[PDB]
Amino acid sequence: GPLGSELSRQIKAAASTLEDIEVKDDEWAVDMSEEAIRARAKELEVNSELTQLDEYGEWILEQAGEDKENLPSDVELYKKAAELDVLNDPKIGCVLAQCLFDEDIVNEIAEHNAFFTKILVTPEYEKNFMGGIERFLGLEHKDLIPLLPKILVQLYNNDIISEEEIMRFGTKSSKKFVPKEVSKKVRRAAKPFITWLETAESDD
Amino acid sequence: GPLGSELSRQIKAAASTLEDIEVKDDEWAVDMSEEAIRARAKELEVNSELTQLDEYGEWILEQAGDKENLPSDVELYKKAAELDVLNDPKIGCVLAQCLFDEDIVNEIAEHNAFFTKILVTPEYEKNFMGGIERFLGLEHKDLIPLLPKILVQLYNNDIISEEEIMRFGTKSSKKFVPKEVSKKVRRAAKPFITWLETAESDD
Amino acid sequence: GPLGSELSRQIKAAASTLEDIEVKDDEWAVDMSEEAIRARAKELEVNSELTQLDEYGEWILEQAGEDKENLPSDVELYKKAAELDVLNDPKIGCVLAQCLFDEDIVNEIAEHNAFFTKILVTPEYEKNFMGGIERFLGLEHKDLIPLLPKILVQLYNNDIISEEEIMRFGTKSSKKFVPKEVSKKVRRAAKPFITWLETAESDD
Amino acid sequence: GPLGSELSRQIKAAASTLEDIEVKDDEWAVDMSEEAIRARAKELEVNSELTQLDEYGEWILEQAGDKENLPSDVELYKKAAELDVLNDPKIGCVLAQCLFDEDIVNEIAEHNAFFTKILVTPEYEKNFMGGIERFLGLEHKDLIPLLPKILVQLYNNDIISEEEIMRFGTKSSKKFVPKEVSKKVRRAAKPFITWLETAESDD
Amino acid sequence: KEPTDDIAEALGELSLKKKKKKTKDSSVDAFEKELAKAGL
Amino acid sequence: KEPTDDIAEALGELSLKKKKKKTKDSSVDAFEKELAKAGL
């Protein structure tokens, strides 16, 4: 056929590799091979910090529910972070950006100023928070991307995120949080605000 | 070009799907969607349900290395009691996948009193048979020809009930092995199963 | 992530292999590489017989159109086959089965008896015709699969296809014309007729 | 399991798509659907449109083997007239992809009268530039750094118009090369293109 | 409850009765005559 | 013709005016007081 012997063999091998993964994943709970036992042991050590972040996000979502008006108090949000030992993890900003907000984000992002100042210790935390916003709008709620200019005004005016990190989010391609096509779309939706900022900084 | 629109559209769809999987895997550690959290939580729950069974299996495999150096039946039972796996019907799945090697036809009859003591319910027997289906169907396909002989030992030594041997040979599992492997294993068992069906009909 | 370094590398390589195929296929007409020139030359020699079958099918479809009541006469169908030198090709049955019929197949399959006797020279031609029916119902017109018992009655009663080839179509898995899942579905839709035949042959 | 439902569903979708492509390819020779016939007919039509161009290219590549043994400009023109490709604007695409090697910066100025005689319209020049984009962007990516020098020769020897050099350096093609390759080639050309833009502005 | 029209029509037509070999060979003769008129 | 509500609201809010650093540090004090009441 049009593929040729070599490409047909490559495609068939890929399919079989994928089919084997599906069998291994589907039968994991009855798999007592040395490979599966060792893998389950490694997943515990490698994902310890991730499990702690997951538990924080799960608690936030479980306590607030669909509406973010039932969100635990900022004091409660901080206490749980300390309890789970995630305060020293820059990815806590990524968790908060993806779990604290709903469709009322423009109003919600400005209701936790003191909390963010205390939690976002370094620019790395701010970058992780911006990455989380990129995922929340670019991947999970594409319908809210039109709110990005307003979201950025709230971040800049309330000094929640530095001008430098807002500029990196709007002008730099980071493959760490979202795919390149999603990044391009978010930066475009941010351009109206970023252009204003670049001009305001040029005017000094 | 040579492909035609349909084949080209499909090759493009396959590439996009594969790229999407790469990005999901690359971004797993920053993915805090409800679905990613639920997925990691569900695996943690399964991993935790298997902690004692995994520890039992690893100890068997480490202590054995050749299954002649397998720990004694007495040591196997004592370790099971220490890890609290005796009350877990899946202990049969662990034992079937960790105690045997190429000498299974003989080894499967060298632990009679142990298996009689530990396989206390038909559920334990079903789990043991599932483990055998995995040992032969997935991990050692070269030993599938030994199945009628293995079943003869299990039936002759009263290790597994005839009702459970019949389920393994007549029923399609999805739990322990893929449908293709179940069909292959049941076919290799047909010689013994046929005999058991006639004996049951005669009696 | 859950894939692991090795499987991630395998998936990325597969994607790149597929992306390269798409580029090569999309730019074929501007590709003057030694590979493309040589490939275009090979496709002509390798697909000579296939081009002749294609031309026959194209002519049948072009002359009849959507309705198979405008089909050229059996004499015309034979003359074109000779003109294209496809009479000596067992795959002519596969072409005819896929191009001569529409939703009125039950009636149409019995309107060309003498033609089929002359065209389907060996059991191999009959097998190719049955393969074509398998593709027509199992892949192109899944809505007509319920007509298979009736289609088989017309084939058996009019002696268009041998009992032996009807039985192979209904009881054997041939990966040559359709995928295994499609074969299983067609043989199931045929089982009502096949059961009758197996019993009639047992009764002798 | 470790994948989670979403990643598992995607891996299953990728496997099914790949299996579907394998079956389409395996059954191509018995596929007499209107779509399969149309596809094979469309490729035959494209192959036929390229018969003389392919024969011209193969003759160039065979006769050359080192492009120093390239046939003479006189022989290149005579063969073009014999194969009736002189009136085909795509002759530029063939020549750009078959006449040059690692010594292109010099070779691209050793055929001035030939190119002046054969590149009779801007369409021929566009096709030549597309062929260069393929030669450098796809077949010899190591030679992409030579693009500003190649463009200097093309502009200095009046082989390609400034209007067409600007299109190659400023416009995104999809016809000759993928968007990623166009972006890379246009970036490597920027040093010369910038100069040409200023000269045009000054004049 | 699935439709039964297609299966019922087939079930009713079921019959060991088949086209006579001579009848099949006879229809062949008219066709061959039409072919001869076309030079084949 | 696309809606303009989201962009227009943002365009109207555009302002170099920013939260005072002292104001930011002051809100921090009430929060730290709430934290001290919790032993943190």
XYZ file of C-alpha atoms in Angstrom, chain D:
203
model
C -3.593 2.516 36.983
C -0.699 4.972 36.815
C -2.037 6.626 33.594
C -5.460 7.775 34.827
C -8.635 7.632 32.710
C -7.800 10.560 30.347
C -4.280 9.413 29.390
C -5.568 5.775 29.094
C -8.450 6.807 26.796
C -5.957 8.784 24.621
C -3.440 5.869 24.423
C -6.383 3.591 23.417
C -7.513 6.140 20.747
C -3.950 6.386 19.357
C -3.635 2.567 19.167
C -7.026 2.255 17.374
C -6.093 5.010 14.864
C -2.717 3.328 14.188
C -4.442 -0.101 13.751
C -6.922 1.551 11.333
C -4.074 2.973 9.242
C -2.402 -0.483 9.136
C -5.656 -2.079 7.819
C -6.235 0.702 5.218
C -2.661 0.101 3.917
C -2.982 -3.720 4.098
C -6.308 -3.647 2.151
C -5.420 -0.874 -0.400
C -5.165 -3.298 -3.364
C -8.741 -4.664 -2.798
C -10.236 -1.295 -1.766
C -12.587 -0.320 -4.629
C -14.469 2.379 -2.692
C -15.068 5.654 -4.592
C -12.617 7.303 -2.140
C -9.819 4.795 -2.763
C -10.337 5.004 -6.563
C -10.379 8.870 -6.430
C -7.199 8.837 -4.315
C -5.246 6.515 -6.661
C -6.572 8.478 -9.695
C -5.474 11.813 -8.146
C -1.924 10.482 -7.491
C -1.766 9.110 -11.097
C -2.773 12.597 -12.391
C -0.011 14.284 -10.276
C 2.522 11.601 -11.287
C 1.633 12.211 -14.981
C 1.906 16.029 -14.601
C 5.493 15.362 -13.340
C 6.693 12.773 -15.912
C 8.945 15.115 -17.992
C 10.186 17.080 -14.903
C 11.115 13.768 -13.154
C 12.923 12.485 -16.287
C 14.841 15.840 -16.447
C 15.782 15.617 -12.751
C 16.839 11.955 -12.892
C 19.040 12.691 -15.965
C 20.697 15.603 -14.111
C 21.324 13.456 -10.971
C 22.581 10.419 -12.965
C 24.863 12.470 -15.297
C 26.281 14.439 -12.323
C 26.511 11.660 -9.742
C 29.936 15.636 -7.677
C 28.161 18.484 -9.537
C 31.465 19.370 -11.321
C 30.556 16.493 -13.723
C 27.139 18.208 -14.115
C 26.210 18.308 -17.794
C 27.095 21.600 -19.532
C 24.624 24.528 -19.557
C 24.243 23.878 -23.317
C 23.421 20.174 -22.602
C 21.073 21.154 -19.718
C 19.134 23.476 -22.117
C 19.066 20.962 -25.011
C 17.743 18.196 -22.704
C 15.083 20.590 -21.340
C 13.932 21.355 -24.919
C 13.936 17.614 -25.788
C 11.729 16.772 -22.699
C 9.451 19.820 -23.363
C 10.048 21.261 -19.814
C 11.184 24.795 -20.956
C 7.535 25.981 -20.941
C 6.989 24.538 -17.423
C 7.558 27.059 -14.596
C 8.380 24.107 -12.258
C 11.666 23.511 -14.182
C 13.119 26.005 -11.633
C 12.053 23.698 -8.767
C 13.821 20.721 -10.469
C 17.043 22.678 -11.207
C 17.350 24.153 -7.673
C 16.948 20.647 -6.128
C 19.244 18.757 -8.603
C 22.113 21.065 -9.819
C 23.715 22.012 -6.475
C 25.734 20.461 -3.659
C 27.902 21.752 -0.766
C 29.651 24.127 -3.281
C 26.311 25.922 -4.063
C 27.604 29.441 -3.147
C 29.979 29.211 -6.161
C 27.871 26.907 -8.410
C 24.823 29.252 -8.195
C 26.829 31.879 -10.187
C 28.345 29.459 -12.761
C 25.021 29.122 -14.749
C 24.048 32.830 -15.206
C 23.230 32.769 -18.930
C 21.408 29.417 -18.515
C 19.157 30.757 -15.715
C 18.563 34.070 -17.599
C 17.463 32.042 -20.642
C 15.199 29.564 -18.701
C 13.713 31.625 -15.768
C 11.494 33.648 -18.189
C 8.758 34.718 -15.699
C 8.501 35.594 -12.013
C 6.675 32.221 -11.588
C 9.846 30.384 -12.729
C 11.878 32.432 -10.192
C 9.365 31.648 -7.391
C 9.699 27.907 -8.259
C 13.533 28.184 -8.216
C 13.396 29.889 -4.790
C 10.999 27.157 -3.547
C 13.512 24.539 -4.708
C 16.302 26.318 -2.773
C 14.009 26.438 0.328
C 13.649 22.625 -0.024
C 17.363 21.999 -0.809
C 18.475 23.934 2.331
C 15.414 23.670 4.643
C 14.730 19.951 4.153
C 17.595 18.127 2.380
C 20.795 19.947 3.542
C 20.004 21.871 6.779
C 23.781 22.225 7.396
C 23.939 24.643 4.409
C 21.219 27.022 5.701
C 23.973 29.377 7.070
C 25.024 29.952 3.390
C 21.636 31.570 2.518
C 22.707 35.281 2.815
C 25.689 34.479 0.560
C 23.461 32.505 -1.887
C 20.998 35.425 -2.007
C 23.897 37.877 -2.640
C 24.922 35.863 -5.722
C 21.303 35.617 -6.954
C 20.816 39.418 -6.531
C 24.279 40.405 -7.925
C 23.995 38.148 -11.020
C 20.373 39.239 -11.711
C 19.326 35.506 -11.570
C 16.324 36.238 -9.288
C 14.434 39.580 -9.089
C 14.595 41.590 -5.838
C 10.762 41.320 -5.682
C 11.018 37.477 -5.629
C 14.000 37.389 -3.191
C 11.878 39.600 -0.870
C 8.867 37.208 -1.183
C 11.110 34.241 -0.239
C 12.499 36.122 2.766
C 9.280 37.813 3.954
C 6.393 35.516 2.912
C 5.451 32.210 4.575
C 5.097 29.386 2.042
C 3.156 26.217 2.694
C 3.694 25.041 -0.915
C 7.404 24.091 -0.801
C 8.215 23.706 2.889
C 6.492 23.275 6.271
C 5.880 26.504 8.345
C 8.686 25.575 10.809
C 11.189 25.249 7.889
C 9.952 28.538 6.294
C 10.526 30.358 9.651
C 14.048 28.900 10.004
C 14.986 29.739 6.351
C 13.553 33.297 6.544
C 15.526 33.898 9.787
C 18.786 32.744 8.153
C 18.022 35.107 5.265
C 17.176 38.102 7.501
C 20.760 39.548 7.349
C 20.550 39.985 3.530
C 16.801 40.758 3.495
C 17.303 43.626 5.975
C 19.931 45.111 3.662
C 17.640 44.779 0.618
C 14.760 46.444 2.496
C 16.987 49.457 3.356
C 18.305 49.753 -0.219
C 14.689 49.708 -1.516
C 13.721 52.361 1.108
C 16.784 54.514 0.178
C 15.862 54.222 -3.555
